[PDB]
From Swiss-Prot:
Species assigned in the record: Homo sapiens (Human)
Sites of Phosphothreonine modification: T8
Protein name: Histone demethylase UTY
Role, per record: Male-specific histone demethylase that catalyzes trimethylated 'Lys-27' (H3K27me3) demethylation in histone H3. Has relatively low lysine demethylase activity.
Impact when changing S236G: No effect on lysine demethylase activity
Gene from which this protein is expressed: UTY
Subunit structure: Interacts with TLE1 and TLE2.
Effect of P312I: Significantly higher lysine demethylase activity
Residues shown, of full length: 880 to 1344 of 1347
Highest classification ranks of the organism: Eukaryota, Metazoa, Chordata, Craniata, Vertebrata
Occurrences of domain JmjC (ranges): 140-303
Chain sites annotated for binding Fe cation: H191, E193, H271
Gene Ontology molecular function terms on file: chromatin DNA binding; histone demethylase activity; histone H3K27me2/H3K27me3 demethylase activity; metal ion binding; RNA polymerase II cis-regulatory region sequence-specific DNA binding
Positions bound to Zn(2+): C376, C379, C403, C406
Compartments, as annotated in UniProt: Nucleus
């Protein structure tokens, strides 16, 4: 049915007014729109995409690291086993590193070679995709990062309405810019964003990308398929067979992103992308202040625990920063945050009383401002407030963090550990008590 091939939510921008019009940010963050393509965005804002051209990038930081994916050049929207006899979900990708200068040479010679060839069931050729290029350093990428502050607030890397701004520290590639350098067939395989955060992607050009999108609420179907085909949904490289998805009554949005078009991926939307031509892309994440964003981020945070996968977003730390610093006026989002804080508080009280009842000392350790959230050095779970550190690491002042469970597993009565406390209970209770719903009339 055509309900399985829905139209792409699209906004067509002409000028700065259209870009700054409030209904645009509302349309993007509406859960009903799994993806929004904001066409003509760069043109409307007079954004200089030339600052992200391969020539410019080479001049700026020619030795900068590029992660290379070596992949097969597959036809159209398909993925075939290498023998070319059946379509399969697993895709072949080898990883290596290079520099912006070397990948640039390849990107150009790739184009020259296609010109020559034009003047003339696989097996398939190999291509290289330059991915995950880290544009976090403002000293190396001043002009590039400055250009992006011309976006409307809701889409910027940094803004008051962005939950990632409220984390209070860098999360690489989420609240810092990533760049991609591509040749035709460069594939970003199927995924959801880290902790289901929204994402922004702008195509620099000169060529096009083709996007495939499934709504968040079908992510389970794709997780199922993955397991049925011996794949880790979160961690393997897979490229959905569209025939399988259609048979499964999964709607698939598909569109072309042209140079200067911004793609807004909504919370939890499943997606995969390929370069149609030669192009670069830039991307980052944004966390709008909505009930839907927070709910989905919390859910994936908890799912990640079950799957033994680290959450790049420390949702406990973030939740406390929202309560300390953000007046929240949406009643549904308020109740979610308030609920989470209460769970955190009651688990922390239960653990801290257990320690005290067992006669284990709790050491006042405190905290530096802007100090990042801590994760367990063994299981990578976020650890809040009570840090378990070995006697030795404490002595050395390396303060290597374990969670309670990992510490107990090593050291049955915690005899090898000290317990460090970063926050007074009375102070957390106060932050919770004073976190109340603000009135907004809109
Ligand atoms: C799988 C989560 N992740 C980060 C992992 N890296 C930090 C390794 C992402 O960056 C997800 N977004 C990648 C992406 C890249 C493109 C692209 O190739 O343009 C389009 C859409 N999405
Ligand atoms: Fe993505
Ligand atoms: Zn642990």
């Amino acid at each position: 049915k055509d309900k399985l091939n829905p139209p792409t939510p699209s906004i067509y921008l002409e000028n700065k007014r259209d870009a700054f019009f409030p209904p645009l940010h509302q349309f993007c963050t509406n859960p009903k729109n799994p993806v929004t393509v904001i066409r003509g965005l760069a043109g409307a804002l007079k954004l200089d995409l030339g600052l992200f051209s391969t020539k410019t990038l080479v001049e700026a930081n020619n030795e900068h690291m590029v992660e290379v994916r070596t992949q097969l050049l597959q036809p159209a929207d398909e993925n075939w086993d290498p023998t070319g006899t059946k379509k399969i979900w697993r895709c072949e990708s080898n990883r290596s590193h290079t520099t912006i200068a070397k990948y640039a040479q390849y990107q150009a010679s790739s184009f020259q070679e296609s010109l020559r060839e034009e003047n003339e069931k696989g097996p398939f050729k190999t291509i290289k995709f330059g991915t995950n290029i880290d544009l976090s350093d403002n000293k190396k990428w001043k002009l590039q990062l400055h250009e992006l502050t011309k976006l409307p607030a809701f889409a910027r890397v940094v803004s008051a309405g962005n939950l990632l701004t409220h984390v209070g520290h860098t999360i690489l590639g989420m609240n810092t810019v990533q760049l991609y350098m591509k040749v035709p067939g460069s594939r970003t395989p199927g995924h959801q964003e880290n902790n289901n955060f929204c994402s922004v992607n702008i195509n620099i050009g000169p060529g096009d990308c083709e996007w495939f999108v499934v709504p968040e609420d079908y992510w389970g179907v794709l997780n199922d398929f993955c397991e049925k085909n011996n794949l880790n949904f979160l961690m393997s490289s897979w490229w959905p067979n569209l025939e399988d998805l259609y048979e499964a009554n999964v709607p698939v949005y598909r569109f072309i992103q042209r140079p200067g078009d911004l793609v807004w991926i909504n919370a939890g939307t499943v997606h995969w992308v390929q370069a149609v031509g030669w192009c670069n892309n830039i991307a980052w994440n944004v966390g709008p202040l909505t009930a839907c964003q927070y709910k989905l981020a919390v859910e994936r945070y908890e799912w990640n625990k079950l799957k033994s996968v680290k959450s790049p977003v420390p949702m406990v730390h973030l939740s406390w920063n929202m309560a300390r610093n953000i007046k929240v006026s949406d009643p549904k989002l308020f109740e979610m945050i308030k609920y989470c804080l209460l769970k955190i508080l009651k688990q922390y009280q239960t653990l801290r009383e257990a320690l005290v009842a067992a006669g284990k000392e709790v050491i006042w350790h405190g905290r530096t401002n802007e100090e990042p959230a801590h994760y367990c050095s063994i299981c990578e779970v976020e650890v809040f407030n009570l840090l378990f550190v070995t006697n030795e690491s404490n002595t050395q002042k390396t303060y290597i963090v374990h969670c309670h469970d990992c510490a107990r597993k090593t050291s049955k009565s915690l005899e090898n550990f000290v317990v460090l406390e970063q926050y007074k209970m009375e102070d957390l209770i106060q932050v919770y008590d004073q976190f109340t719903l603000a009135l907004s009339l809109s």
